[PDB]
Amino acid sequence: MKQYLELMQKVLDEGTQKNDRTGTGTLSIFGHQMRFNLQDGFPLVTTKRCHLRSIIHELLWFLQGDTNIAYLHENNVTIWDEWADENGDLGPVYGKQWRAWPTPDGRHIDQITTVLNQLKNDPDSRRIIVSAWNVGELDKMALAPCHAFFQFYVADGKLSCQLYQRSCDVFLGLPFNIASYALLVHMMAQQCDLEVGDFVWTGGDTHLYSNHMDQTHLQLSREPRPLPKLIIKRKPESIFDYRFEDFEIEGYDPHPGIKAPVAI
Amino acid sequence: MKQYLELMQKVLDEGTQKNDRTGTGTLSIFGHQMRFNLQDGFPLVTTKRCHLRSIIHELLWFLQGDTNIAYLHENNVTIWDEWADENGDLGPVYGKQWRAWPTPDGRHIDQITTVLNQLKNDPDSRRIIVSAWNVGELDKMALAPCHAFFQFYVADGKLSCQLYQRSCDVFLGLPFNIASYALLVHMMAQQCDLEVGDFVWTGGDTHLYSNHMDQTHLQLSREPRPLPKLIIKRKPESIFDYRFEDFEIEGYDPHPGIKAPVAI
Numbered sequence: 001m002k003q004y005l006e007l008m009q010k011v012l013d014e015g016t017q018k019n020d021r022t023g024t025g026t027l028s029i030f031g032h033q034m035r036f037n038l039q040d041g042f043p044l045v046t047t048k049r050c051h052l053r054s055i056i057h058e059l060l061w062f063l064q065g066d067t068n069i070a071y072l073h074e075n076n077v078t079i080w081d082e083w084a085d086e087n088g089d090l091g092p093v094y095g096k097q098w099r100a101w102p103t104p105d106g107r108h109i110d111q112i113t114t115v116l117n118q119l120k121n122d123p124d125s126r127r128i129i130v131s132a133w134n135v136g137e138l139d140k141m142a143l144a145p146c147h148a149f150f151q152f153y154v155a156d157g158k159l160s161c162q163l164y165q166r167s168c169d170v171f172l173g174l175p176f177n178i179a180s181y182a183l184l185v186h187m188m189a190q191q192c193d194l195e196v197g198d199f200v201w202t203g204g205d206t207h208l209y210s211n212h213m214d215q216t217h218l219q220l221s222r223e224p225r226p227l228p229k230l231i232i233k234r235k236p237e238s239i240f241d242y243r244f245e246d247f248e249i250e251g252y253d254p255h256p257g258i259k260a261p262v263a264i
Numbered sequence: 265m266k267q268y269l270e271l272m273q274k275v276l277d278e279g280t281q282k283n284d285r286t287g288t289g290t291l292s293i294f295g296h297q298m299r300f301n302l303q304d305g306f307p308l309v310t311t312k313r314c315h316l317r318s319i320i321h322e323l324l325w326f327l328q329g330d331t332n333i334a335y336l337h338e339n340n341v342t343i344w345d346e347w348a349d350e351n352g353d354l355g356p357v358y359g360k361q362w363r364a365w366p367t368p369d370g371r372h373i374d375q376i377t378t379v380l381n382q383l384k385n386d387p388d389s390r391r392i393i394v395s396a397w398n399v400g401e402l403d404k405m406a407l408a409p410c411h412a413f414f415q416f417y418v419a420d421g422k423l424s425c426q427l428y429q430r431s432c433d434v435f436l437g438l439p440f441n442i443a444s445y446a447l448l449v450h451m452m453a454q455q456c457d458l459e460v461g462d463f464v465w466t467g468g469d470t471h472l473y474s475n476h477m478d479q480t481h482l483q484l485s486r487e488p489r490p491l492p493k494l495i496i497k498r499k500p501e502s503i504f505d506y507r508f509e510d511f512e513i514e515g516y517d518p519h520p521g522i523k524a525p526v527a528i
Contacts (some may be wrong), residue, residue, distance in 0.1 A: 019388055030417040031426050031464035033297040102368045102402030111399065124283055126431035126469045127408050130395050135375065136367030144391050149413055151430055151468050153294040155280040162295050162468055164428050166415055167390035200295035202466050204415050204426055205390045239305040 001045045002224050003034040008170055008216055011208045018207070024263045026169075026207040032069055033203075036182065038196035039158075041112070041227025042249060043182050045175040047219050054079050057181050063097030063112065063240055067092065075244075083142040091141035097132040115152060116239065119192045119256060125153040147177060152188070158197030159189045166204040170177040171212040171219075171260055183230070183247070191239050212260045219258055228252035265309045266488050268296040268442070272434055272480055275472045288527045290433075290471040297467075300347075300446065302460035303422075305491025306513060309439040309444050311483050313518040315360070318343050319444050320511055327376065327504055329363030331356065335505055339508075347406040355405035361396040379416060380503065383456045387418040411441060416452070422461030423453045432469040435476040435524055447494070447511070454496060455503050476524045492516035 015027030036043045044050055057077045064071070069080055069088035084090050092102075100108035111130040118128045132145035149164040164180055168174050182199050189196050189250075208216060234246045275489035280290030287337060300307045308314055321341045323339045328335070333344055333352035344528050348354050356366075375394040393416075396409035413428040427445055432438050453460050497511045 018419055020386075028419060030419065030424055031293065031297065031462070031466075033301060033466060035295060101399045104366045104368055105400075107276070107400070109399050124285075127402075129397065129412070129430060131395070131399060131413075133393065133395050133397070133413070134399075135365045135373050135395060136369075136371070138391075148393070149395075149428065153469060155282055155292060155294065160294055162466075164413065166393060185364070198295070202295075202297060202426075202428070205417060 001043065001047060001227070002038065003036065004045060004170075004174065005047065005112065005224060007034060007174075007206070007221060008208070008220055010169060011118050011206060012216065012220075015208065018205075020209070020263075027210065028205050030205055031196050031203070032206045034159045034201045036178070036199045036201070038182060038185060038187060038199055042179070043199065044179045044228055044249065044254075046225035046227065046252065046254045047222045049257040050179070051192070052179065053077070053244075055176060055183065056244055058079040059180055059183055060242060061243065062098055063242075065095045067094075069097045072137070080178060092134065092137040093141045094145060096131050096132050097137075097145070098130060101131075101134060103154075105180040116188075116191065118202075119152060119154065119159070119188070119194070123194075126149065126204055128152040128154075131174050146173075147181070150181070153197075155197070157195050159185060159192065159194040160197035160200065161185045161188075162200040162202060164204070165174060165206075168203050170206060170208050172262075173218055174247045186230060187239055187242060190235055192194070209260075209262070215258045215260045223254045225253055225255065226251070265307065265311060266493070267300065268309060268438065269311065269484060269488060271296060271298060271438075271474070275434060275470060276480065276484075279472065282446045282469075282474070284519055284527075287453070289474045291365060291474065292469050292471040294469055295467070296465075296470045298465045300442070300463045300465070302446060302449060302463055305461065306443070306494040307490055308443045308513065308516060310489035310491065310516065310518045311486045312439075313521040314443070316443065316511070316513055317508075319440060319447065320508055323444055323447055324506060324508065326359045326362055327506075329406055331358075331360045333468055356398065356401040357362075357405045357407070358396050358409060359485070361401075361409070362394060365395075365398060366401070366419075376503065380452075380455065383416060383418065383423070383458070384451070387458075390419075392416040392481050404432070410437075410444070414445070417461075418458060419461070421459050423449060423458040424461035424464065425449045425452075425455065426464040426466060428466050428468070429470075432467050432470050434472050436526075450494060450507060454499055474525075475527065479522045479524045486519045487517065489517055490515070500517065502517050 018028040022086050043151050054077050069084045131149050133148040153160045228249045229253045231248045281295050282292040318341050333348045352523045395413050397412040411429050417424045492515045495512045
């Protein structure tokens with residue numbers, strides 16, 4: 001992908017050497033925004049092979065309000081394992097804030113039903129927002145929300161979404177995180193009878209880890225191949241109703257996978 | 265100012281006609297990011313005269329955790345009047361979330377002391393964030409947070425800040441809102457013994473109201489005059505200690521004020 005490749009180049013050319021949490025040096029820039037028009041094709045990186053299945057399964061887990069790893073395990077999805085305790089609990093992380101944000105008076109606010117209410121009945125709102133940055137619960141979560149905050153916008157029957165990501169690893173994390181939300185703009189739009197507009201990605205500490213240098217050089221040498229097309233095979237009766245098999249990606253010919261290790 | 269003038273031009277050239285809350289048509293774009301390097305001068309618009317005093321006073325009110333209009337009144341600051349009830353209460357809006365975010369278990373989290381702790385003892389954090397988007401309290405606030413969310417970053421002794429603004433009126437609102445946070449990056453940096461870096465502004469529904477068309481045309485015809493220089497005259501003992509008179513702006517020669525009305 002072109003916008004992504006432009007970002008990769010930029011953190012190599014402009015980033016400051018900054019450390020991780022007593023770890024790995026990174027090259028970091030701060031403050032980057034990229035726009036993906038979803039009508040031009042699905043934003044899945046063609047410059048290295050990326051697979052959709054852990055992406056799809058992790059999102060359906062978010063939408064269920066699940067905070068325990070069990071569902072992912074049933075499906076041999078392992079990405080959150082690193083974070084979960086013995087009984088598979090992750091603390092009040094994303095699914096929890098999204099579907100049952102706790103109030104000081106005992107309520108649990110379902111932010112994505114709110115968002116669907118707002119998109120059908122008041123599409124012109126400037127407050128169509130869901131947040132996972134619940135300050136009162138940050139101390140109990142495995143990790144603090146990386147994609148912390150996002151907002152929808154409707155103009156001319158096109159639903160667009162801006163995401164605020166506080167910290168992103170451009171090589172390993174970012175391809176995954178761009179396709180997860182593009183999937184979500186497409187579930188949302190089908191459920192609201194709106195067309196897809198844009199996915200705007202804004203980031204904060206946007207970084208390359210230094211032991212991913214050869215891999216980014218490899219990748220920056222590859223020409224972006226055309227973008228695939230996502231097809232949702234069923235219109236479920238609601239957004240908490242999609243199932244893994246409702247999704248197909250057609251026309252994707254990526255260049256090979258590049259693996260990249262992590263310090264520990 | 266150049267970045268601002270570039271934005272004004274862009275919403276006139278690219279915005280979609282979108283309505284307000286049963287009101288005024290606006291021209292709206294969605295998703296804009298601009299960078300101001302604070303070492304190049306203070307970002308106070310020179311293309312129309314803007315005064316600093318309501319800006320300074322409203323920020324000190326935010327920092328006090330005040331939600332009642334009294335302090336502003338004592339000082340003949342009137343900007344929030346439109347919103348306050350009879351007894352001057354505004355609901356749990358900004359000062360309240362900033363200094364006493366309520367947890368579900370009875371605590372009140374002081375987010376800006378947190379932020380100062382993080383900036384002196386762990387300057388490399390990717391979690392140096394304060395949020396005013398307290399979902400549990402949105403129903404009790406006069407209006408929902410417009411500047412909802414912001415994040416600090418330290419690299420090479422330069423403190424930078426990215427702001428997420430969900431809705432901005434580019435003519436009347438935006439000059440005010442850019443100088444308020446630039447002031448805050450400068451209080452923060454003096455208290456942390458860091459230099460100022462960048463102020464990154466990200467916006468969501470960024471709009472011009474249509475009955476501000478002649479005024480924006482007037483203004484887009486004016487050449488940006490050089491940027492002033494803010495001088496803080498005292499180093500208070502903390503951030504809750506600045507006083508109105510600690511601030512002077514030197515070298516500001518703006519073009520005249522342009523007034524712009526609002527529908528009701």
